[PDB]
Amino acid sequence: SEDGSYGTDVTRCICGFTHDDGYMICCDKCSVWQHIDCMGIDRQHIPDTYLCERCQPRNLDKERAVLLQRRKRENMSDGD
Ligand SMILES: [Zn+2]
Ligand SMILES: [Zn+2]
């Protein structure tokens, strides 16, 4: 209805691919869920207050993040 929309936690990862890994983080500012490996963060060192590329003054390799999660789903095609 034309009033609003309730749904804070929204998975808008820059790779255009949703939760399959298990290794994700919520963006404290704009409330968007992204994959750790996508934002170039180490899964060994996970920050509390995550920011995504659009919240960070630094430009993260968004294209490279697409390449990783894309080739991931391309690789998920078993058979001969
Ligand atoms: Zn991703
Ligand atoms: Zn953000």
Curated annotation (Swiss-Prot):
Which sequence ranges does the entry mark as zinc finger (PHD-type)? Answer: 10-58
Report the outcome of residue 33 to A. Answer: Loss of binding to tri-methylated 'Lys-4' of histone H3 (H3K4me3)
Sites where the protein binds Zn(2+) 1: 13, 15, 35, 38
| Positions with a binding annotation for Zn(2+) 2 | 27, 30, 52, 55
PTM statement from Swiss-Prot or TrEMBL? Ubiquitinated. Deubiquitinated by USP7.
- Quote the tissue specificity entry: Widely expressed in both adult and fetal tissues. Highest levels of expression observed in fetal thymus and kidney and in adult hematopoietic tissues, jejunum and cerebellum. Isoform NKp44L: Not detected on circulating cells from healthy individuals, but is expressed on a large panel of tumor and transformed cells.
Indicate the impact reported for residue 23 to A/K.
Severe reduction in the binding to tri-methylated 'Lys-4' of histone H3 (H3K4me3)
Q: Where in the cell is it found?
A: Chromosome; Cytoplasm, Cytoskeleton, Microtubule organizing center, Centrosome; Nucleus speckle
Disease linkage in the record?
Answer: O'Donnell-Luria-Rodan syndrome: A neurodevelopmental disorder characterized by global developmental delay, speech delay, intellectual disability and a subtle facial gestalt. Additional common features include autism, seizures, hypotonia and functional gastrointestinal abnormalities.
Q: What is known of its domains?
A: The PHD-type domain binds specifically histone H3 tri-methylated at 'Lys-4' (H3K4me3), thus promoting binding to chromatin.
This chain's function reads: Associates with chromatin regions downstream of transcriptional start sites of active genes and thus regulates gene transcription. Chromatin interaction is mediated via the binding to tri-methylated histone H3 at 'Lys-4' (H3K4me3). Key regulator of hematopoiesis involved in terminal myeloid differentiation and in the regulation of hematopoietic stem cell (HSCs) self-renewal by a mechanism that involves DNA methylation.
Oligomeric state and interaction partners are given as:
Component of a complex composed of KMT2E (isoform 3), OGT and USP7; the complex stabilizes KMT2E, preventing KMT2E ubiquitination and proteasomal-mediated degradation. Isoform 3 interacts (via N-terminus) with OGT (via TRP repeats). Isoform 3 interacts with deubiquitinating enzyme USP7 (via MATH domain). Isoform 3 interacts (via HBM motif) with HCFC1 (via Kelch domain). Isoform 3 interacts with E2F1; the interaction is probably indirect and is mediated via HCFC1.
**Homology family:** Belongs to the class V-like SAM-binding methyltransferase superfamily. Histone-lysine methyltransferase family. TRX/MLL subfamily.
Q: What is this protein called?
A: Inactive histone-lysine N-methyltransferase 2E
Its gene?
Answer: KMT2E
